Amino acid sequence: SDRVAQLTIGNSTITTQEAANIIVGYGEWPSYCSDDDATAVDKPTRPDVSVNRFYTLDTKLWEKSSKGWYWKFPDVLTETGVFGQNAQFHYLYRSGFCIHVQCNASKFHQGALLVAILPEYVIGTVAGGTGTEDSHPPYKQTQPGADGFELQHPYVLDAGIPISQLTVCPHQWINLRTNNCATIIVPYMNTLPFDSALNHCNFGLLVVPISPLDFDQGATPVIPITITLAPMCSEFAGLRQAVTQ
Amino acid sequence: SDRVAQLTIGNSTITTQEAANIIVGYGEWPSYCSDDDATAVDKPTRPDVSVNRFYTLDTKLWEKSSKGWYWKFPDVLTETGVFGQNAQFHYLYRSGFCIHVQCNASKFHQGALLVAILPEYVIGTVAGGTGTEDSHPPYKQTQPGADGFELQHPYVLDAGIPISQLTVCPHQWINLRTNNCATIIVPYMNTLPFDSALNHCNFGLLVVPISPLDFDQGATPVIPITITLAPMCSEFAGLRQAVTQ
Amino acid sequence: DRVADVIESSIGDSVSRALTQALPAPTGQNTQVSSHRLDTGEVPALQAAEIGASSNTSDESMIETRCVLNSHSTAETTLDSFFSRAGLVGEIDLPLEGTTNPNGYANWDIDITGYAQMRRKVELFTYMRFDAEFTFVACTPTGQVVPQLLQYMFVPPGAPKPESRESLAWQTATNPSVFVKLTDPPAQVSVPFMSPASAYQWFYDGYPTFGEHKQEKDLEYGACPNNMMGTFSVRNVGSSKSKYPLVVRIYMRMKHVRAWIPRPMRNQNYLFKANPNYAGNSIKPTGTSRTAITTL
Amino acid sequence: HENSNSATEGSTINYTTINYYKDSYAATAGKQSLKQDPDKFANPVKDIFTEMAAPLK
Amino acid sequence: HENSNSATEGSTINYTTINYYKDSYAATAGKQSLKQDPDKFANPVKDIFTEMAAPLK
Amino acid sequence: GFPTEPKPGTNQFLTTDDGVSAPILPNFHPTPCIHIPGEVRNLLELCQVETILEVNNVPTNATSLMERLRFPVSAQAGKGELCAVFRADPGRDGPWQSTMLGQLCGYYTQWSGSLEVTFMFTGSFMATGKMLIAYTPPGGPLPKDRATAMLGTHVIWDFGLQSSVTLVIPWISNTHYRAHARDGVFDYYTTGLVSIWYQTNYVVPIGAPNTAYIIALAAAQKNFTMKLCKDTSHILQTASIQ
Amino acid sequence: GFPTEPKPGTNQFLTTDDGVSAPILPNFHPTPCIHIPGEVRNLLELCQVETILEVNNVPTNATSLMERLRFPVSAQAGKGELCAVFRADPGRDGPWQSTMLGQLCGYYTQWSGSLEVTFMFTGSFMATGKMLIAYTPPGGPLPKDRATAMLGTHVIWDFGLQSSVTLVIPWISNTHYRAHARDGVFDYYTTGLVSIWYQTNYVVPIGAPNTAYIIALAAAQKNFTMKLCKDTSHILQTASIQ
């Protein structure tokens, strides 16, 4: 009664028989915005079930040489579903998330993925190699939406910070000999009650292989990793027309 | 019971059937001078009805190109009536006013006059155009009495201040599709309990067309604007001979 | 009268669940006596890192322990304790001959990410709220003290930024200025937490413009206006050439600090302000290196 | 009396500081309350378990 | 004791200031009472009306 | 003497430092303060007073400066034409600078609160018409048509005895306060856009002008406040005062 | 004036001096503080969080930097071979520098408390094995074999569902605190050595990898505290920030 679990939100239900408990980001469940914390004077929309549900957005293939991937969050879920819509029509957005990364293999396979939540995950460039050029990461890299982006220098999280310390962040590992999925529940985290789901990304989801995937030849070599996230306590205010970016 | 009104003071009575309420300058009815606010030790004269009444001083013609006019106040009422007299014989004067500007047209005419009360309305010169000459507005311009004076640069109230903000002053508009007269009730306002009605003008009355007068040809084109003011709680002290200026 | 799912609908709970509480930690935890334990079923030493929680194994269950009354304090490891230490954050030159800042005045964009020591410390957390004490040490390039009068003026974003030594903005009718002789002890001032956000943000993953976001504009990624506090302007107080070359060092000391969301410590060298870029070719390891895991 | 305008306003921690101006943000950093919450970062787990137990039942 | 000679003497507002000289006008500007009266400039109307109503009956 | 140790900041003259100082006139007693009308206590009392918004800040001929105060509206020949448009930002360059609010903002670094903009119609009594005033929050690009504009906060204004209608521009922001919005980067603090479309059309009988004007007046709502004051930018002289 | 006599220290600017100072903005009131997740109160809250210990701090090829995070363990062919070894000193150069604890130490001159190092096995489910992790206190030279290492504090780790095992490095010191240990003379403050030996062997069936890795994670125990803070040495930039 700790390795098996079921997550049910909206009209979606995730099952898992090898999970390793659930992490609750910074030990705080997602809440709605207080009356004294808010400033936007208009009564917000709380679609509830139409947006607070499990969107299974992407699948990556883990290979004996994969570097790792990340997904910026507020964004990843735009354009997809009713959530996407409310995020485009409204200026202000607010919401916590239930992230469930899954990836299974056999008892004869081995490997270990680090799954973390890095708030305000600002990306940096290699500065033209030498460090004299003041380059900047492109829209395609800082806000990749679904499909995420692949890391080029995971050791420093493409941002000059050691991944060795990335665990001071809500994390969970996917050790194949132990489990087959991670489950983080992040609350809304920003220095503001609401912000634009479009141009600001509250945090990134990191999935990095720290202990390389490996298996004797002959065992199914296609080992996918699938991301499934679900917004929680979604609130929207500041209604205008629909906006893409 | 808000568009029709009757003002009765002394032996004068003004009627109006399209007025838009009454403004009371800075929310304060005209009062007499307190015993602790005064300094002049002589017992003053309070003529009451002989001076607190409705003097209908002037009429201007509003034209599709009129710039606007002003009247300095304490002064405007001198030489005219018993008020005038008490103002010439006495050094010290004190009094509030009930200003009623009227101007009517047809339901087929259109336009809108701004009617404001600007305290300590100091007039300025164009400084010889270039701004190198330190010119000064003439007695005929700073103290025009009745007949008022026409503005030459209304946008700046001939004093380098935006008319766009003139509304932070007791004002009222005369929109022809809405009303046919303005009614402001200003209290005595100066940094002194009494002052010389002659050489100091507590405030000016501004009447400026912000939305130009207009009408299809054939409709009576003579659209007058008439000023009617009435002193209130007039007090005079410091009696000497009669003085003009 | 209602629809039930509406009477339940916990939608609108403004309070956060929690799960964890804050306890008093004036001293380090004491060590209570331990004895041998030979039993099946209870395995403290065994953990599962996958869960994502740090091992909760106590020294007591790992070895027979004595009793120790730990009275060591934890006061020096608080935030005010850690961060409330003046440090260099800005430097300004006012040379006689040059191209940097002649004319006798300078406009320093208030950005504390220009000096590596201080920068790394704060970049430990994502958000930070606090008041600060700014101190300004001025003198010539030789460290020599000179009888010169300066004027430091804080210019909020929106206020007119001085264009010359004799600019009109130096009338400083509402901006707060400080007049000081270089012979007087360094000027020092108390600064409140002035920001439209609730905390300064060291890292802002996103843009502020809201437009197209082409190549030429990637300059703005990571630029959060809630940290642009305006500029700090200084000038020798006069009409003519200063007569002496000056330098102003700006030291900031935080106080009444609140920090949130700790993140990994800067691993590589810093290259630019408000931009985590790193040398692509010179990516050095976090620490030292040996010749083999089996030798020291 | 003194404006209540420091950064640690309304905070859950109690500070004892010295000040000479109307604005409280001028006040010293001062001595303060020593509370902590390791579990927020060390044990942000939904279902706590004990050391004695086997983390995965 | 202290001369009562500041500019805000007899004022309807209550100020709490610090001073070291006999004359009260030397005293600091100090913290003070926060009252307001918008209607004096915004609604100097003789017969108030409400927002709910039609301004011209 | 009593042992003391002077700290940094000594001898510095801090403009905004509020301390004491030796008084020049001992025992001096000021002129009693009389009672004077219209006393102010807080600048916010002024920010709630409506002043003319120069929506039509186009003319500059110096002989046409007066026509900035009002914009026109006349019989259209189609459906949903665009009348006027403007930035709903107060401390920014544009129409809001002609207002009293606009001006007081220039003195404070940040602000918060809802804004109100009353539109008074000055056409003839015989003219009818329904306009649609629409405030489009941040991120919303200037609407291309009425059907798009209406998706945001709006109000259908009908011409009648009640000359004017007020459009409230509610405080809808991600942040608690807003520093002045100004094109580059600081457009982060933009309030949004206001657009006026023709809900129906300006109707008139034979005999009335085929074109009239609307005068806009603006101020701040009761929840409006500003903090951290600086000096205005809007203006700074050139020649030194003679 | 009131008689005073200024003492030495006058006018000096002491970085860490905590006093008051004239405030620039009178009556200023900061933006209300919202509620924000994960607030920190004391750095010690962070020192108890486990971070990856680079036990295998050997590779530097820049294309192999990622393999410092874990060390290998594979089917041996003998008895009691040595897997890995490392200094149990936190504020010293070496594996401990990749940790969060290591980094925070660089900011404080001294520390005290027990340390914990959890070792997670990432091999296949089919792989069995028993390792012997041994912490050898000060004065004890790096053990030459298992039979010697075991004479100190140790723990026999068995591979099972519970992937990881934690080795507690108890605070065993002559002094109440420890300044950072660093080779010359200051090796007086060394904590000791940690060595990992093969208790039995890494066993595997036909079909599973003959080699897997272990990831080490480390932090401080509840009784850990630090005092007297300084600046870090571990790092200092080269070029000036552009």
Ligand SMILES: Cc1cc(CCCCCCCOc2ccc(C3=NCCO3)cc2)on1
């Ligand atoms: C008198 C006087 C006082 C002053 C200076 C007042 C400075 C107040 C500074 C507050 C700075 O807060 C900061 C927060 C964040 C950042 C930052 N830089 C990169 C992004 O974050 C910089 C400063 O000038 N004159």
